[PDB]
Design a protein around this ligand. Structure first.
Ligand SMILES: [Zn+2]
Lengths: 106, 51, 135, 204, 105
RNA sequence: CAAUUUU
RNA sequence: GCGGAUUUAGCUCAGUUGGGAGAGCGCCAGACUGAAGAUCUGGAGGUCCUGUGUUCGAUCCACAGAAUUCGCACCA
RNA sequence: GAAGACAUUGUCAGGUGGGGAGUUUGGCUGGGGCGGCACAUCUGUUAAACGAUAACGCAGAUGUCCUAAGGGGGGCUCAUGGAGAACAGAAAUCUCCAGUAGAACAAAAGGGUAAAAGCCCCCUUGAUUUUGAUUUUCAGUGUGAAUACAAACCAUGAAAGU
RNA sequence: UUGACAUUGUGAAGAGACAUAGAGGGUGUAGAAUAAGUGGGAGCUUCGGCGCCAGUGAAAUACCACUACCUUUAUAGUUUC
RNA sequence: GUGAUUUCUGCCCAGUGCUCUGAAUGUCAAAGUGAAGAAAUUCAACCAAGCGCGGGUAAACGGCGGGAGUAACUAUGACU
């Protein structure tokens, strides 16, 4: 048989990046996500409840709706010849704001 | 398969009994009145070989 | 019940027709008491027939039948369709009393596929008509 | 029906010869099996009383024993420890109360042979204490049934007339029906016979 | 797997529409079948010759079959279902397993 | 009715 | 799937109010004979497949389960 | 003469029936057959630092199990090592100190966890109901599986929440 | 091969079976008796015997109201071999 | 079925097949009887043959293996 599981061949991406153990730093729960903002994705193996997939790692997208601890984002993914605007759904810990639109903002 | 050789027998095809030298039916007289109320006197003529 | 001839019970076909001993012979048991009269009384004409008795294995019928060429029947106009040679052996092609129900002909919604003779109303609808000015 | 006027009009009057108290009993016919499914159960409603002569082994010591004095027979206390082991063997009705909800410690030694044990087959600590005074002296079957059927009570007093045995008979009719399935036979009660002590045999 | 009775949960209902008692049971198929359309469209094809029209089944592979427990309300007395997943041995009674005292090899 | 051995 | 059948100290018959775990065969001891043998008795073993009811109490009357076959069918 | 309403004859029903008929007898395969399942899945690696990827490559696993081993709340420190106390020893229970996880978390491997997600108590059934969206496999089909809601009903906690 | 039905008509005897009546008896203890029933009772009776408020046994003990289980039996009604 | 004569045809009936004038309900067709209901219909009992059970059967199909201990030194095992 062959490995095509939901988090196969991704041993090294969900380690919590050693000497950085413990729980989540509590600046991540005092920060706003309004619709139209631009964010990245970086998965943490602290909470096993709402990871992004193996693929959607280090990629940038706009948010489109929010709920009590949830942010849905838009990522372009390809199948051979086209792009498709995926519409994911994430727990808010795995998201940093993408620090790229300050040097265009400011 | 084929019909085995105790099935092709019972058709009268070639297995008919050879019937050239059989002199006649080896069987005796039926009941006349002269048989169950007395006697009638026979006389042997010859003894033969029924083949 | 009729069983088909089939030497030593062999069918030689797909197993739906493989069974032998309980076919039914779609014509009536009265209409085969009319052919073997009709094919020895060849000069007569049979008007109709009926039932009389049933023992263990026989089912007697008593066929009434008409002389067509008799001189009282060629005149005396109540029966001048029998001399008309369209009714020559009107039992063997099935147009007697059981020739008009075992052939299947009655009016109605439940006498449909045999309403005017099956083979005409088979080859009249799964033919396809093609006009000059095709529609 | 078992009487319109059939065989219970005249055979009740010339047996006024034994002046002893006459109540003709009753059984019926319902087959069952070696289980204990729906036999001598289903406490019925009989409005005519018994005017019984038995004893009541009461367990109630609140000063509403004023009410137990006029509605019952024998008023005891909770010193049941050593006497009542093999003493009562002829006991019809008992009624106890809410103080004895756990003081069944010394009645289960004696209630094994006469078999009116304080399990779910003889529930004497009854909550509501106003319906359980007048009717409840009347005989109606509350017992564990032996192997196939026990369905019993006395029909009526031979002295007391037939004023209500045409309508309470109609709720004498409804006993065994509405809990078991139709494994019960139909027309359980059939030909009715009357013999208290003096009556002859008659089959309807 | 050990399951209890009494299963206090959401009745479907129209009376309560609220969490009430449900004393569970477990059902088999009941009566199998008779005169139900896809059984007597099937006896039409069996009758006669040919034999064994529609496919009989020989390749069995499973061992456990999906124990399904049907609920039963006690106020409106309706009957809803739920399915537990596959298990080989299934009871419906006691032995609330206390913690690791009684080992005794 | 049935009974084996004693360098 | 579905209806019956049997599970007993190691093994086989036991065992039917329900009061009774017994016999035989396996280890150990006593007897018997002048002794060896064979033969006799005794020592002990048992959850009567289990659980619940049944009942004064059950192998015995049941229901459920575990195992062993007998049969009987067969639209995913 | 026999025999007699039994046989025979016909219809229907069961049993026997390779005598006879019709058919089928997989696939992947360093020829084919045998062996095996690489025929659905899952874990780490070969995989060439986004993703995708092969061989009868590598080392393993699955067709279960769970009234709690689920859910919540409260409360405790683990494996080991040093040191001690009658029987007590290489291994028994009680106590002190060190103790970043070297233990445990049903079941293979990998990730993850410390006033826990480990262990000990208390209470419970959200292991409900109505249909939708979304991610992985994808042709961006389905099934399997999972994430976040809304409308209701509730469990726990002091509530926030869960 | 086996059964059912026609084919197919007229008889006697035997034997069951089935219900309908009726019938007698019936285990470990005690109570007062070879104790298989019930809800109950305390008396009709030539007895004042048996009961009971008396013992004791799983049981209450004369009576079935209705049968549990029998055939062991008797007759006609249902048929069957 | 073996293949003149001579001389022999050992043991095994548990499997398979055949047979049997054995006994029970253990299963077992349609039809027929009975109960319910208003009926179509459901349920129950009787349930023939054959299976099953027990026996017979090898000039019927066939089969003929193992393991311990024991004989004066070993060895082997007449013996159980
Ligand atoms: Zn409800």
């Amino acid at each position: 048989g062959k490995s095509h599981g939901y988090r196969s061949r991704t041993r090294y991406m969900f380690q919590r990046d050693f000497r950085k153990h413990g729980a989540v730093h509590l600046s991540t729960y005092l920060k706003v996500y309004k619709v139209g903002d631009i964010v990245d994705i970086k998965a943490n193996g602290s909470i096993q409840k709402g990871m992004p997939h193996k693929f959607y790692q280090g990629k940038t997208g706009v948010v489109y709706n929010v709920t009590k601890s949830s942010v849905g984002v838009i990522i372009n993914k390809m199948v051979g010849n086209r792009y498709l605007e995926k519409r994911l759904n994430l727990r808010v810990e795995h998201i940093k704001h993408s620090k790229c639109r300050q040097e265009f903002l400011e | 398969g084929r019909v085995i050789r105790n099935q092709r027998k019972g058709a009268g095809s070639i297995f008919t009994s050879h019937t050239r030298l059989r002199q006649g039916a080896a069987k005796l007289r039926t009941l006349d009145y002269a048989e169950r109320h007395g006697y009638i006197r026979g006389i042997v003529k010859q003894i033969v070989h029924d083949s | 019940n009729r069983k088909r001839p089939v030497p030593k019970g062999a069918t030689y076909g797909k197993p739906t027709n493989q069974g032998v001993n309980e076919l039914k012979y779609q014509r009536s048991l009265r209409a085969t008491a009319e052919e073997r009269v009709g094919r020895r009384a060849a000069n007569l004409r049979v008007l109709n027939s009926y039932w009389v008795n049933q023992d263990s294995t026989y089912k007697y019928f008593e066929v009434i039948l008409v002389d067509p060429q008799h001189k009282a029947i060629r005149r005396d106009a109540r029966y001048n369709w029998i001399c008309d040679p369209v009714h020559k052996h009107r039992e063997a092609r099935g147009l007697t009393a059981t020739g008009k129900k075992s052939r299947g002909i009655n009016k109605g919604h439940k006498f449909n596929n045999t309403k005017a003779g099956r083979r005409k109303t088979w080859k009249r609808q799964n033919t396809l008509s093609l006009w000059r000015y095709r529609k | 029906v078992k009487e319109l006027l059939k065989y219970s009009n005249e055979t009740k009057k010339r047996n006024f010869l034994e002046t002893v108290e006459l109540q003709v009993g009753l059984k019926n016919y319902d087959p069952q099996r070696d289980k204990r499914f729906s036999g001598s159960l289903k406490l019925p409603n009989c409005p005519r009383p018994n005017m019984s002569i038995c004893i009541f082994g009461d367990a109630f010591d609140v000063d509403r024993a004023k009410s137990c004095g006029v509605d019952a027979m024998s008023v005891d206390d909770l010193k049941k420890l050593n006497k009542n082991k093999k003493l009562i063997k002829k006991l019809s009705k008992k009624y106890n109360a809410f103080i004895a909800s756990e003081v069944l410690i010394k009645q289960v030694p004696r209630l094994l042979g006469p078999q009116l044990s304080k399990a779910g087959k003889f529930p004497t600590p009854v909550s509501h204490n106003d319906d359980l005074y007048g009717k409840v002296t009347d005989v109606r079957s509350t017992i564990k049934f032996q192997l196939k059927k026990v369905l019993c009570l006395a029909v009526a007093v031979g002295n007391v007339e037939m004023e209500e045995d045409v309508l309470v008979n109609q709720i004498l009719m409804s006993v065994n029906f509405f809990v078991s399935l139709l494994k019960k036979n139909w027309q359980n009660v059939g030909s009715l016979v009357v013999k208290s002590s003096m009556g002859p045999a008659f089959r309807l | 797997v050990n399951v209890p009775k009494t299963r206090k949960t959401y009745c479907k209902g129209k009376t309560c529409r609220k969490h009430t008692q449900h004393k569970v049971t477990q059902y088999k198929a009941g009566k199998a079948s008779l005169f139900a359309q896809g059984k007597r469209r099937y006896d039409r094809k069996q009758s006669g010759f040919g034999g064994q029209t529609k496919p009989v089944f020989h390749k069995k592979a499973k061992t456990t079959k999906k124990v399904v427990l049907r609920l039963e309300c006690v106020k409106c007395k309706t009957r809803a279902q739920l399915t537990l997943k596959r298990c080989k041995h299934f009871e419906l009674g006691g032995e609330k397993k206390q913690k690791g005292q009684a080992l005794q090899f």
